[PDB]
DNA sequence: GGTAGACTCGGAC
DNA sequence: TCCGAGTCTAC
């Protein structure tokens, strides 16, 4: 799921788990657990804690318990569900948090690609994977000036810059391509080659694109199809190690 | 210390 | 054989 979908999960999952107390934690694929390193320690430490809140940072979900925070990243296909302990599990269920009320929070992932880290709450923001995360794209802390400062300092492409989690939190491939299209900037342009005007416009379109999504596509996945603005066939290439979609006429 | 490469997966191709 | 998010490893 991308940032808007993670926000939807945050909002919808919270009332389904708040105030529930963890009775057991069952782990069927230990490699998902990244901290503590031993999955048995991860399970043991969560027992007896009550869920107090659920926050989002970029695409990370931060489950707030009594003492600990559980930091979860779903990557491309990870999913959470709340359901009865009496019912059979769905396929690809890797971690289950069992509550005292006979309900469960279940983590599934066909790709087995997601991650979980647990730390004392006061520690979580200074440890991986949250340490060094850049500002929320919809926050005043992500500004044209912040973006300009990062862009001038790098040799990388503008696409590479926007995909960098230290620059801006959880701005995914789809939204990078869409924002660059809407701003009229080629993804392969060196970040340092962007004018002040281009940086301002890019910031504006990033906020608009992801803001709209949290509340249709021009380029992403539309290679070979006509651009919706000018009719030129959308092209796809590799930029910053990712499939990258753009209109060669609208973007410069 | 900035930046690329390795690493994790399994469904689609 | 391709893909990819974000951390870890190595130049
Ligand atoms: Zn166009």
PDB file of C-alpha atoms in Angstrom, chain A residues 30-149:
ATOM      1  CA  UNK A  30      10.330 -15.063  12.145  1.00  0.00           C
ATOM      2  CA  UNK A  31      12.315 -13.044   9.536  1.00  0.00           C
ATOM      3  CA  UNK A  32       9.539 -10.376   9.560  1.00  0.00           C
ATOM      4  CA  UNK A  33      10.720  -9.508  13.054  1.00  0.00           C
ATOM      5  CA  UNK A  34      13.721  -7.188  12.829  1.00  0.00           C
ATOM      6  CA  UNK A  35      13.967  -5.945  16.449  1.00  0.00           C
ATOM      7  CA  UNK A  36      14.437  -7.446  19.004  1.00  0.00           C
ATOM      8  CA  UNK A  37      16.505  -9.805  16.844  1.00  0.00           C
ATOM      9  CA  UNK A  38      15.013 -12.895  18.548  1.00  0.00           C
ATOM     10  CA  UNK A  39      11.343 -13.329  17.578  1.00  0.00           C
ATOM     11  CA  UNK A  40      10.705 -15.041  20.937  1.00  0.00           C
ATOM     12  CA  UNK A  41      11.738 -11.828  22.720  1.00  0.00           C
ATOM     13  CA  UNK A  42       9.523  -9.752  20.409  1.00  0.00           C
ATOM     14  CA  UNK A  43       6.548 -11.974  21.273  1.00  0.00           C
ATOM     15  CA  UNK A  44       7.267 -12.143  25.009  1.00  0.00           C
ATOM     16  CA  UNK A  45       7.646  -8.409  25.460  1.00  0.00           C
ATOM     17  CA  UNK A  46       4.294  -7.540  23.884  1.00  0.00           C
ATOM     18  CA  UNK A  47       2.241  -9.842  26.160  1.00  0.00           C
ATOM     19  CA  UNK A  48       0.183  -7.971  28.700  1.00  0.00           C
ATOM     20  CA  UNK A  49       0.348  -4.638  26.879  1.00  0.00           C
ATOM     21  CA  UNK A  50      -2.776  -2.766  25.873  1.00  0.00           C
ATOM     22  CA  UNK A  51      -3.081  -0.959  22.528  1.00  0.00           C
ATOM     23  CA  UNK A  52      -3.331   2.787  23.147  1.00  0.00           C
ATOM     24  CA  UNK A  53      -2.950   4.367  19.725  1.00  0.00           C
ATOM     25  CA  UNK A  54      -1.939   4.094  16.102  1.00  0.00           C
ATOM     26  CA  UNK A  55       0.087   6.700  14.244  1.00  0.00           C
ATOM     27  CA  UNK A  56       1.571   6.913  10.784  1.00  0.00           C
ATOM     28  CA  UNK A  57       5.001   8.163   9.750  1.00  0.00           C
ATOM     29  CA  UNK A  58       5.489   8.032   5.969  1.00  0.00           C
ATOM     30  CA  UNK A  59       4.371   4.504   5.064  1.00  0.00           C
ATOM     31  CA  UNK A  60       5.230   3.154   8.542  1.00  0.00           C
ATOM     32  CA  UNK A  61       2.479   2.307  11.029  1.00  0.00           C
ATOM     33  CA  UNK A  62       3.376   2.976  14.691  1.00  0.00           C
ATOM     34  CA  UNK A  63       1.242   0.938  17.081  1.00  0.00           C
ATOM     35  CA  UNK A  64       1.476   2.566  20.528  1.00  0.00           C
ATOM     36  CA  UNK A  65       1.132   0.168  23.461  1.00  0.00           C
ATOM     37  CA  UNK A  66       1.622   0.676  27.217  1.00  0.00           C
ATOM     38  CA  UNK A  67       5.445   0.691  27.239  1.00  0.00           C
ATOM     39  CA  UNK A  68       6.423  -0.196  23.659  1.00  0.00           C
ATOM     40  CA  UNK A  69       5.834   0.993  20.096  1.00  0.00           C
ATOM     41  CA  UNK A  70       5.539  -1.586  17.297  1.00  0.00           C
ATOM     42  CA  UNK A  71       6.773  -0.139  13.979  1.00  0.00           C
ATOM     43  CA  UNK A  72       5.377  -1.952  10.981  1.00  0.00           C
ATOM     44  CA  UNK A  73       6.014  -1.575   7.235  1.00  0.00           C
ATOM     45  CA  UNK A  74       3.705  -3.479   4.873  1.00  0.00           C
ATOM     46  CA  UNK A  75       5.811  -2.962   1.728  1.00  0.00           C
ATOM     47  CA  UNK A  76       3.781  -3.725  -1.435  1.00  0.00           C
ATOM     48  CA  UNK A  77       1.327  -6.423  -0.348  1.00  0.00           C
ATOM     49  CA  UNK A  78       1.237  -6.509   3.475  1.00  0.00           C
ATOM     50  CA  UNK A  79      -2.227  -6.343   5.022  1.00  0.00           C
ATOM     51  CA  UNK A  80      -3.784  -6.201   8.523  1.00  0.00           C
ATOM     52  CA  UNK A  81      -7.160  -7.644   9.536  1.00  0.00           C
ATOM     53  CA  UNK A  82      -8.994  -8.021  12.828  1.00  0.00           C
ATOM     54  CA  UNK A  83     -10.940 -11.242  13.250  1.00  0.00           C
ATOM     55  CA  UNK A  84     -11.990 -13.999  15.642  1.00  0.00           C
ATOM     56  CA  UNK A  85      -9.482 -16.479  17.105  1.00  0.00           C
ATOM     57  CA  UNK A  86     -12.163 -19.152  16.462  1.00  0.00           C
ATOM     58  CA  UNK A  87     -11.937 -18.896  12.660  1.00  0.00           C
ATOM     59  CA  UNK A  88      -9.275 -20.415  10.384  1.00  0.00           C
ATOM     60  CA  UNK A  89      -6.470 -18.061   9.345  1.00  0.00           C
ATOM     61  CA  UNK A  90      -6.254 -16.710   5.785  1.00  0.00           C
ATOM     62  CA  UNK A  91      -3.285 -17.885   3.635  1.00  0.00           C
ATOM     63  CA  UNK A  92       0.085 -16.119   4.094  1.00  0.00           C
ATOM     64  CA  UNK A  93      -0.601 -15.049   7.682  1.00  0.00           C
ATOM     65  CA  UNK A  94       2.820 -14.480   9.256  1.00  0.00           C
ATOM     66  CA  UNK A  95       2.210 -12.752  12.606  1.00  0.00           C
ATOM     67  CA  UNK A  96      -0.881 -12.763  14.811  1.00  0.00           C
ATOM     68  CA  UNK A  97      -1.479 -10.647  17.880  1.00  0.00           C
ATOM     69  CA  UNK A  98      -4.031 -12.433  20.057  1.00  0.00           C
ATOM     70  CA  UNK A  99      -6.157 -10.251  22.341  1.00  0.00           C
ATOM     71  CA  UNK A 100      -7.776 -11.171  25.677  1.00  0.00           C
ATOM     72  CA  UNK A 101     -11.221 -10.661  24.134  1.00  0.00           C
ATOM     73  CA  UNK A 102     -10.785 -13.556  21.668  1.00  0.00           C
ATOM     74  CA  UNK A 103     -10.110 -11.279  18.685  1.00  0.00           C
ATOM     75  CA  UNK A 104      -6.822 -11.102  16.787  1.00  0.00           C
ATOM     76  CA  UNK A 105      -4.873  -8.615  14.727  1.00  0.00           C
ATOM     77  CA  UNK A 106      -3.432 -10.588  11.813  1.00  0.00           C
ATOM     78  CA  UNK A 107      -0.622  -9.610   9.494  1.00  0.00           C
ATOM     79  CA  UNK A 108      -0.589 -11.266   6.063  1.00  0.00           C
ATOM     80  CA  UNK A 109       1.879 -10.812   3.240  1.00  0.00           C
ATOM     81  CA  UNK A 110       1.981 -13.039   0.143  1.00  0.00           C
ATOM     82  CA  UNK A 111       5.472 -11.624  -0.622  1.00  0.00           C
ATOM     83  CA  UNK A 112       6.705 -12.105   2.948  1.00  0.00           C
ATOM     84  CA  UNK A 113       8.458  -8.742   2.515  1.00  0.00           C
ATOM     85  CA  UNK A 114       7.267  -6.514   5.380  1.00  0.00           C
ATOM     86  CA  UNK A 115       9.082  -5.628   8.595  1.00  0.00           C
ATOM     87  CA  UNK A 116       8.307  -5.228  12.325  1.00  0.00           C
ATOM     88  CA  UNK A 117      10.490  -3.518  14.984  1.00  0.00           C
ATOM     89  CA  UNK A 118       9.507  -3.062  18.678  1.00  0.00           C
ATOM     90  CA  UNK A 119      11.207  -0.592  21.029  1.00  0.00           C
ATOM     91  CA  UNK A 120      10.316   1.325  24.194  1.00  0.00           C
ATOM     92  CA  UNK A 121       8.058   4.149  22.924  1.00  0.00           C
ATOM     93  CA  UNK A 122      10.560   6.870  23.812  1.00  0.00           C
ATOM     94  CA  UNK A 123      13.250   5.141  21.763  1.00  0.00           C
ATOM     95  CA  UNK A 124      11.351   4.325  18.548  1.00  0.00           C
ATOM     96  CA  UNK A 125      11.879   7.647  16.734  1.00  0.00           C
ATOM     97  CA  UNK A 126      15.674   7.439  17.147  1.00  0.00           C
ATOM     98  CA  UNK A 127      16.137   3.820  15.999  1.00  0.00           C
ATOM     99  CA  UNK A 128      15.588   2.095  12.680  1.00  0.00           C
ATOM    100  CA  UNK A 129      13.426   2.179  10.683  1.00  0.00           C
ATOM    101  CA  UNK A 130      12.146   5.598  11.813  1.00  0.00           C
ATOM    102  CA  UNK A 131      15.522   7.193  12.480  1.00  0.00           C
ATOM    103  CA  UNK A 132      16.373   9.774   9.793  1.00  0.00           C
ATOM    104  CA  UNK A 133      12.900   9.723   8.183  1.00  0.00           C
ATOM    105  CA  UNK A 134      12.209  13.043   6.435  1.00  0.00           C
ATOM    106  CA  UNK A 135       9.188  15.298   6.941  1.00  0.00           C
ATOM    107  CA  UNK A 136       5.589  14.343   6.179  1.00  0.00           C
ATOM    108  CA  UNK A 137       4.795  15.527   2.610  1.00  0.00           C
ATOM    109  CA  UNK A 138       1.582  17.198   3.870  1.00  0.00           C
ATOM    110  CA  UNK A 139       3.295  18.998   6.759  1.00  0.00           C
ATOM    111  CA  UNK A 140       4.655  22.565   6.884  1.00  0.00           C
ATOM    112  CA  UNK A 141       8.049  20.919   7.606  1.00  0.00           C
ATOM    113  CA  UNK A 142       8.182  19.805   3.987  1.00  0.00           C
ATOM    114  CA  UNK A 143       8.700  23.103   2.161  1.00  0.00           C
ATOM    115  CA  UNK A 144      10.147  24.372  -1.135  1.00  0.00           C
ATOM    116  CA  UNK A 145      13.232  25.550   0.813  1.00  0.00           C
ATOM    117  CA  UNK A 146      13.791  22.104   2.362  1.00  0.00           C
ATOM    118  CA  UNK A 147      13.473  20.525  -1.090  1.00  0.00           C
ATOM    119  CA  UNK A 148      15.779  23.146  -2.700  1.00  0.00           C
ATOM    120  CA  UNK A 149      18.485  22.595  -0.032  1.00  0.00           C
TER     121      UNK A 149
END
